[PDB]
Amino acid sequence: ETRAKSLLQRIILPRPGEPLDVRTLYVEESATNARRAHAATRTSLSIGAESEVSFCTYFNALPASYWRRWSILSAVVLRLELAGHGRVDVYRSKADGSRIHVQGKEFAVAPGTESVSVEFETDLGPFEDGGWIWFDITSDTAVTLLAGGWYAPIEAPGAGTIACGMPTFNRPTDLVKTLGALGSDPLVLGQVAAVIVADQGNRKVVDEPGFDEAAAVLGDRLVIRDQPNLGGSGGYSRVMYEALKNTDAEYIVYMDDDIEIEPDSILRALAFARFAKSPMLVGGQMLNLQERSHLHSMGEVVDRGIFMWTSAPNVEYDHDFAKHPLKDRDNSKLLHRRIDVDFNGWWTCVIPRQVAEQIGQPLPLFLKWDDVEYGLRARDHGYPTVTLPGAAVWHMAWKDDAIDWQAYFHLRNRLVVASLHLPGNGKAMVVNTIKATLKHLLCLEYSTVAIQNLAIRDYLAGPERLFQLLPSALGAVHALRKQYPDAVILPSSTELPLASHLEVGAVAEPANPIAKVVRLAKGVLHNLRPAHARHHETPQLNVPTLDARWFLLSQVDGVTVTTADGRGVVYRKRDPRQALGLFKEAMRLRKELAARFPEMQQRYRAAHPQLTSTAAWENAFGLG
Amino acid sequence: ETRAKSLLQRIILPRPGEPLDVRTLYVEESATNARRAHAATRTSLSIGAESEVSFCTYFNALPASYWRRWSILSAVVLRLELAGHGRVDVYRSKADGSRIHVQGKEFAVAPGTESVSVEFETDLGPFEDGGWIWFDITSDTAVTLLAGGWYAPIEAPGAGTIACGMPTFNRPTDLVKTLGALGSDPLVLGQVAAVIVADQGNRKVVDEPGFDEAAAVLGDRLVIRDQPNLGGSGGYSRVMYEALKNTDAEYIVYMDDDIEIEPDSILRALAFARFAKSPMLVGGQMLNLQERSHLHSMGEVVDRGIFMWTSAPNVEYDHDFAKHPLKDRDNSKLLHRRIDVDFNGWWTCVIPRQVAEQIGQPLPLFLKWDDVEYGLRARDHGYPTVTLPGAAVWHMAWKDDAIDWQAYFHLRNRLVVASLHLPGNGKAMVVNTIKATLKHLLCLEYSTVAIQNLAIRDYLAGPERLFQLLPSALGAVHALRKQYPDAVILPSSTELPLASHLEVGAVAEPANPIAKVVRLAKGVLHNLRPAHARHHETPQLNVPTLDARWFLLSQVDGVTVTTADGRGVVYRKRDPRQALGLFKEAMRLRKELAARFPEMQQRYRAAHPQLTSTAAWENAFGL
Amino acid sequence: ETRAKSLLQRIILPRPGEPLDVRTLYVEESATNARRAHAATRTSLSIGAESEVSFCTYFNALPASYWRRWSILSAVVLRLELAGHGRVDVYRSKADGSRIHVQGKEFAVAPGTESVSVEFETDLGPFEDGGWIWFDITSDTAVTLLAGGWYAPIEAPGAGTIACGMPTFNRPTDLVKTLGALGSDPLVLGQVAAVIVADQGNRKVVDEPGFDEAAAVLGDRLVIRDQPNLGGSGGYSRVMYEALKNTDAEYIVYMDDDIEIEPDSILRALAFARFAKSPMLVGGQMLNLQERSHLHSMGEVVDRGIFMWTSAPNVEYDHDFAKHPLKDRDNSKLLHRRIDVDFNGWWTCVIPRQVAEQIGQPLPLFLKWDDVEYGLRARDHGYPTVTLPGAAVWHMAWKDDAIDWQAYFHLRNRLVVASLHLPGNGKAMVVNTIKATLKHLLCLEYSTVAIQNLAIRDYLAGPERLFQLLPSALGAVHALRKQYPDAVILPSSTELPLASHLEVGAVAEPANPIAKVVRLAKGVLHNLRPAHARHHETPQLNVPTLDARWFLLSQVDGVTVTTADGRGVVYRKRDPRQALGLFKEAMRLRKELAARFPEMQQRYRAAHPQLTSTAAWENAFGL
Ligand SMILES: [Mg+2]
Ligand SMILES: [Mg+2]
Ligand SMILES: [Mg+2]
């Protein structure tokens, strides 16, 4: 007689010996409890007498606003199996984090039996701008939650079969763990029709220890394809090609090879994609793999002025649930607002087969902006994208991605997608790139300016080169970078002579803004003077990563800057002649870009159907 | 199968009944734990079920940046012996204290066995500017850590034999405690080849109760010598002399006679010196003996402008770990930066035998600026000094060391080392000493100005007088100070008449700098008028230590000031004639110093091999 | 073998079921302890395994500064008896609250025996400006402190016999409870030779239930004497007379009939009075009876410029140890300084027999300014007064003591004592009383000025009327006050018609000081116009106690003000002619006082020996 029909989200609990900071993602235990809640299994919990455990957490709370805005559901059904005497209280929240009591039931096991069912049904009405639904358990005796989860009162449409896919490149140790975690949960395995791997490196995962057991667990689902290193674009395009050609799944699940999979997130994203009103992309969120209690972002959009991907409104990066729980209205109010996004990353993303077969294959961009363009294309075809809170995987956050080789792909493809979606003349984007070049030159980052000029040149060459540059651009970018001293990395600062500290002045951040202006003037005047070769062989300062800002780099001639991860240093040397030459070349290229932008818009929008075609990608993979 | 090859740092735990604030130096227990962790032994811990214990502490976290910058080690190995069912998560940090989860494991004891081994291996890659490596234990059941420690994956070079040495002076009880603690650890005794003591006081340690048991535990290693009071310089010089002459050890371990020795710190410094790329000095840090949970300084450098020793960059004094643990990124982020130092104190310092035989013996400076000069000499000879975190010893911190007799030895030697490592004319140092003399004369500290003039006069006498002033300057400084009223310490303010509180106005510090300037003007105008003798007999105020600042001593004629430790008072009296005369004499001496500084530089750089030779110190030891 | 000789202070512990906030005066348990410490008796504690208990509390910490400044002791001996396995750590503090570790010992009961002795001896050296000495107990297993206390390493001078004395007036229940508490401790009764009571009321203590048992416990020490109500002055004078005539005790102990006695405080004050360098008055502190975890004052002095009793330097009233313990360096630093006082209250005060026989009897002042004058006379006769921390009793603090009848005795006796100890012409005191009269007239407190004028008149009547006004001033003040509407208390504001709120403007406290000035101007202008009789029958506002300030009372014609304890209201009314006449009379009397001040000084200083004679008080007692 239960209203529960289809499972949407299980009540998952931490692992044996889980760190205390990560436990906040599952349960919010009250400090007044004289005993910590012991998690016997991954779906059961054991709390002692006179204890209160709140499930207003990132994993066990239901985002009712998302299930109201995009799902065909009118109400949700909470079901719990309990043993012992206690009470379960169901609360909801508004768009500003205010707690509202919904219902409450005092439960106890009937004598003669062993367990008791507690069931609530709450409408998705008051969640127009945001809000969650959660439940707290306040025990009178020793209470044990045997099982629980959220349900939809109607059966799930379709079959729900999914084809997973991960592009890998010389990361077999992590791919083995990913496949094992994918095959560990039988509920997830029951929905997987294929597991597609695109090995683009030389160290094949087949030759990795621990691979055969996970492969036997997955059975015939595992399909590994070898191909040249075509980057993330080529890898995910091969995944989608295999899923659309050789598997009969209803949803393609883009994943990454270096993620820690929470298996219930896949089921949550699948159930959300199945109950959607219209076909839509359902992506997952990212938790920091190094700080596992941190949610990296609630959602991402793209500023259409300068055309640049940024955080969605009411979103702040890096949220620590251990320090600021979901109940904290001071620091976690923005988490109670429904976040509307333009795109979602491919670390975990669900694409319906209809959307994939209609809008086509990814663009041959190798890396960067390959997911933003796909999200924008899906939106233009009438398919929105939702970053579903609760469904997430663990992956490393973002370092020197705007300085190293990536600074090439970040710019070129930025100009490509802008050719396909930026409305207007694009002068604001050119001014943004001009000031970015100014900053790069003032910070003694000349290889970045060189490779960005190369990116502008390769972009102005037309879309007909996009498939030729797919496997050969990275080599040229690397060869151009390694000819500048600021790109060659050393083991440590000891490989150079000791810091002389000669001719060093004020290099600390200014306080008042007039000091900022006078230091900018000082830095301009200093960069105008010819440098001293003395500081090109013996560095002046050993500057860390965070101390390497403009107010320090604009007053030096030669400085060792420590890399982001702290594994080495790079010797940046100031050269007025080369700086002026790179600036002149960048301004020439940007003027030509501002002049030819309508032509490039037309050409890229005309070549887009040929770039997303299946035959062109078949020729790219070598299946001619 | 284990990658462990050389023990570098043992996981040590607090003593039975250890104070809670001191326990934070070893373990960081979570407040949500229902039961406090019980340390059965000093090398094992027992935690209850569903508890978490973090080892990101001052004694159980490896300073990976130091073992990357100066050691030949490419990686470290963490080996743990555990009983029960739980999980061990090894983390690291960056230069700003960002916690990076490195690697986790879940352990359980198989049925039929008594314990399990948990081993990790982590490279020393991402530690260019700083960072630690630690591990946390989250228990599912009752979990007992039987043993654990850090291990280098290669064997240790050499033999690891050490010769420890402590100069003592009328402190036999603390020396007996130190000798007992030195021979308490078997792993430490296994590496000690000699224990040299230089008794310079009348109260001999051989006549102290409890000495014979510690002597029998140490064995033939204990070697006690007797010599006149030649200060710390002479004591450590005698220690190094005996070590290089009669012992075949590979390292000399300078220690102090009044320290509480953490035994594993000696082995940590030894392992850090043995795995060094080039020979180097591996000094230890100093924990406050009175506040046993505080670390005094991460390291010390010397500013070459005014030439003065101070805290290294990114170093603040007095860091309480009980209040600000290592995990606190708000108040402990500076402890995650690799601190480069110029020298290290001789409360615990490791000097390789090669370095000692090459650079020589300490200078005959008696007290102050001896370890600084020795570190700078080692640096000039191609040997750096590193203050290794985690390897520390308890000892008192610093009070009146800028007013009492030490103000002599601190200034004179400050000039001596300035004749050796100060590039330039040295006018900045002279201006700094001029303004310091101004501060002293405004604070009615005339004895300090007098002994500083005496220090300048003795420094301008040349290096030939150094060995003559080694056993004779202290008595002269005492006889000079006992002629001033501000240098005579009374038992209490009760020995003087009651405070009159007459003619006492603005003595509380103001809040605006304009008022600071007008009060400085008031004090300048007050130090010009002839003082009233009535206030030189009956004091005006009974001022405590903290209240004795310039905004009070410049508006008074006679005041009793309480000493730093609070065991007495001193009667400071203002005299315009004597103040002006001392100022004139100090200015004349500093003019002569600024004029003759190149001459003194040449004289001290030429006579350096003679003052650091074995024969001169043998003549000084009475040998 | 033990250096302990004389018991100075026992380590006392809370009562069964003691409130948590009161437990902070005895023990400071660590919040991390899994179990709260249980005190099976008042002298034993039982702490569980892995727990820390700090005795740096108000009762179990030794004020080393006071035992160094006023006592002949050179050190203090801490002796404890412990069962179990743990560690004791003795700490001290400086004058600013910095914790300095002194010593530490690990204890464990030897096999066969049941308890072990732990003994420390610490010199009273570094306590010139302040500081305490305490000990912390950190357990390993179950630990039980059976008994402990502080000791002097020399025997106590004299016998230590004390004669107690408590004046009472119609308080039989509290006096019986006080007698029971005084007789409950055998260590206190062993020193008590007499318990003197001066029953000055109609209801006698002899007819109170529960009196016979306390009387039988006290034995023949209880000496009750009946006499007319002569106030506190007469009661304490009769107590001193009886103690000096009919008992052979060494120290008189003034107590109050309505205090909750901590019995060990008496022994602490006695030990401090015996070991003193010179004879001195060792008084005790006052803990708030309504907030038992609060200390009212660390000490009291008297400002000589305007001659008014106030808090001593570095003394803040009302210190809550439950919220701000002694270890809190931010909110309890001032408690770590030695407080020098001018006098001490008579709720608990030890006066040596020599001092009492020499300086004489208290002055016949009825109430107020008697203990101040006695302390000043003692100080003039070379006998200082010291308020000893740790030795305290519980008693009510202070309300309306500046508006009711007490405003009379406080002013008159303020002048009298001034005539004995005020250097100069005393114009500042007259100006202070003038501005106080201005404030009283602004707040519609006309009876206060009406009785202050009577006080100025009776003071100018000469000291020959002091013994005549002893049993007659209270009735005159009462009959004069009850003729004013602001002094007649009503059961509630419901006795008057409801508040009309008519002609009520700005009554909230101004923000910027310019608003304060303009509101003072408005209030001055409002007191110039004729008052409307309408507001004299129906009140305008029902103003609480804390809201009855000048900024509200200076802009009204008739207001009900609630009394301090909240048991009634008074209908204050404004009358411009009456206020003007009271002001004129006050100015006349104050100009006459400022003119005749040297005359009254000479007269009172000449009459003081006759007013403190035994014959005059024998005449006053009816003997
Ligand atoms: Mg990846
Ligand atoms: Mg020392
Ligand atoms: Mg009373």
Coordinates of C-alpha atoms and ligand atoms in Angstrom, one line a residue, chain A residues 256-258 395, ligand 1:
Chain A
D256 CA 36.5 10.8 -16.7
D257 CA 39.2 8.2 -16.1
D258 CA 40.5 9.8 -13.0
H395 CA 37.9 15.0 -9.2
Ligands
MG1 MG 40.7 14.1 -15.6

